[PDB]
Structures are given as structure tokens and as C-alpha cells.
Coordinates of C-alpha atoms in Angstrom, one line a residue:
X1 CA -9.3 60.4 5.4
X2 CA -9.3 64.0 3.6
X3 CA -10.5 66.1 5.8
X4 CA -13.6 66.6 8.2
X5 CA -15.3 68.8 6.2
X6 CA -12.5 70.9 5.0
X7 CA -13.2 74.3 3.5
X8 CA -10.5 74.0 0.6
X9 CA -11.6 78.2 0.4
X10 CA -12.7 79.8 -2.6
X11 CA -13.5 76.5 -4.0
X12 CA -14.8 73.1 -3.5
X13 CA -12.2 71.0 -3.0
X14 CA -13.5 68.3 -6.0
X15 CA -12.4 71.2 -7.9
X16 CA -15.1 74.0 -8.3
X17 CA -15.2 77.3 -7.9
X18 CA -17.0 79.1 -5.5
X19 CA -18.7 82.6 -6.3
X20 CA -19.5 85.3 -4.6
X21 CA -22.1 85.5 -2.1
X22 CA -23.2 88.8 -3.0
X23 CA -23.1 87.8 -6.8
X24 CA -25.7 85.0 -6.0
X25 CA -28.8 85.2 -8.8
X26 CA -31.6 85.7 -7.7
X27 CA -32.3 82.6 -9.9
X28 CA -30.8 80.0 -7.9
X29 CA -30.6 76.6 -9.5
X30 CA -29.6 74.8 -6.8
X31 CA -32.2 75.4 -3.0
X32 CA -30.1 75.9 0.1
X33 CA -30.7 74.1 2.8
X34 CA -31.7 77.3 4.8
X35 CA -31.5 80.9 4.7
X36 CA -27.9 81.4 3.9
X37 CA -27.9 85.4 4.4
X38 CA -26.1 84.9 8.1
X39 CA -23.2 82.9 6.1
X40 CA -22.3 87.1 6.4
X41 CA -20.0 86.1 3.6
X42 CA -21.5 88.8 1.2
X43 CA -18.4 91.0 -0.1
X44 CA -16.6 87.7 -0.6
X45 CA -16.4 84.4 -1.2
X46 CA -15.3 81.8 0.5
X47 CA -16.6 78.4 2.2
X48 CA -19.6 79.0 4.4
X49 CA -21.0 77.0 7.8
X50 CA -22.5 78.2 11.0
X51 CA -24.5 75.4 11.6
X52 CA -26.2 72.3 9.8
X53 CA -23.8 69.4 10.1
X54 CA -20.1 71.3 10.8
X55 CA -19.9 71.1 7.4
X56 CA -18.5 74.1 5.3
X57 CA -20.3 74.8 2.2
X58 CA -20.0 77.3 -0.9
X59 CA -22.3 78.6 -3.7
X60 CA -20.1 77.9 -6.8
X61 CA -20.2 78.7 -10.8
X62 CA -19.2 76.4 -13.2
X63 CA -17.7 76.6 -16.5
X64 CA -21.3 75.9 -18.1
X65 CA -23.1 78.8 -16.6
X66 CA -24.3 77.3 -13.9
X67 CA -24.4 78.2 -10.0
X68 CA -24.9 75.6 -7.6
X69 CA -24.0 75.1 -3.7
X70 CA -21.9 72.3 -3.0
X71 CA -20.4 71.2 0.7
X72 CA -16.7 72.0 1.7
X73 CA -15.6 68.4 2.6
X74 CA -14.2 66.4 0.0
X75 CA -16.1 65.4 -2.6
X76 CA -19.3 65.5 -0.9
X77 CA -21.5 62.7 -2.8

């Protein structure tokens, strides 16, 4: 019981920070599991999920440079 995957907003709710969707690199370290483009999230940031498993995710930056995606849920491992 946390919450069904529960977009915790402009970061994951283990406690990472998401960045922006227009900021994403076109280095990615991390492969989506689709085309993200129609998360239409691009001025912002902010947990994204149209489909996939009603599961909210994010593209995040940590503190060690890196930018990863990582689901909206709670502690998604």
C-alpha cells in the first residue's frame, strides 16, 4: 500500500528528480520503453503515462550526471 502507481510529480517518489522533457539528451542512458514524444510533456516536467501498464513514469537527473527514466509508483524495483 503506497499508491497505484502514483505520480509523486516532478519527481520519483523514491526520491529522484525528474527533468525536463524537452531537456532530454539526445544521449539517453537509459531506452524507453516506446516513443515517449506523445508524453506531450515537452515545456515541462512532470510524471508521464498514456499507456503501457497505468503506470506514470519520468525521465530524471541525478546528482551524478546521469539521466535515466524511472516509473511513478513507489519505488518501482
Amino acid at each position: 500500500r503506497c499508491g497505484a502507481g502514483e505520480p509523486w510529480g516532478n519527481a520519483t517518489n523514491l526520491g529522484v528528480p525528474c527533468l525536463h522533457w524537452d531537456e532530454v539528451p539526445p544521449f539517453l542512458e537509459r531506452s524507453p520503453p516506446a516513443s515517449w514524444a506523445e508524453l506531450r510533456g515537452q515545456p515541462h516536467n512532470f510524471c508521464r503515462s498514456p499507456d503501457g501498464a497505468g503506470r506514470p513514469w519520468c525521465f530524471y537527473r541525478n546528482a551524478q550526471g546521469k539521466v535515466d527514466w524511472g516509473y511513478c509508483d513507489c519505488g518501482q524495483g
